[PDB]
């Protein structure tokens, strides 16, 4: 039993492994009924409008 890794892993191959951890920037889009930005198919956090005002704040 008890597998272990053999040789210490090198800087370069480590970085090739992490090559996929790039983050994906949200596709933001500005609220038509306000100033600020809002996630698509969500209510505008700043205003609260999904078409009238939807959330309280």
């Amino acid at each position: 039993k008890h597998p272990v890794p053999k040789k210490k892993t090198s800087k370069s191959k480590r970085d090739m492994r992490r090559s996929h951890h790039a983050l994906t920037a949200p596709n933001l889009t500005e609220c038509p009924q306000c100033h600020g930005k809002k996630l698509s198919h969500h209510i505008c956090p700043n205003c609260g409008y999904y078409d009238g005002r939807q959330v309280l704040a």
Partner: protein, 129 residues
């Protein structure tokens, strides 16, 4: 257009760091923090204001506050125009590290690394180009 010696240059030129902010000792893994700090980098400081605000990481809080201070000292201290400002620079280096003992099975302990973070951002006018 230059002085006698470094002893004089130290007196007459005082060397400022325009656009610069740094947040030291942030109790967070840098490795995690760079993940967002890359997203921001090179972009319009308003898109940085918006990006940073929906990316869903704990690490987005400190990287938010610094960004403001960058823009703050870009505007209060440096006379820069905020419709030019943008993230010319952003990077996080590792601060010190809290080490703690953690018990594990059959009586062995291990050591555990609570890494801190020195986030840093440098906004500048999009007057380049």
């Amino acid at each position: 257009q230059t002085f006698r010696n470094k002893k004089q240059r130290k007196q007459q030129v005082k060397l400022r760091k325009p656009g610069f902010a740094v947040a030291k000792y942030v109790r967070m893994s840098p490795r995690k923090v760079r993940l967002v700090v890359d997203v921001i980098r090179g972009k319009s400081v308003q898109d940085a204001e918006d990006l940073l605000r929906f990316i869903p990481r704990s690490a987005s809080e400190p990287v938010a506050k610094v960004l403001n201070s960058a823009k703050a000292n870009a505007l209060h201290n440096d006379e820069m125009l905020e419709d030019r400002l943008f993230v010319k620079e952003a990077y996080v280096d590792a601060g010190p590290t809290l080490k703690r003992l953690i018990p594990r099975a059959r009586g062995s302990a291990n050591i555990i690394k609570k890494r801190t973070s020195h986030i840093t951002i440098i906004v500048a006018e999009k007057g380049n180009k």
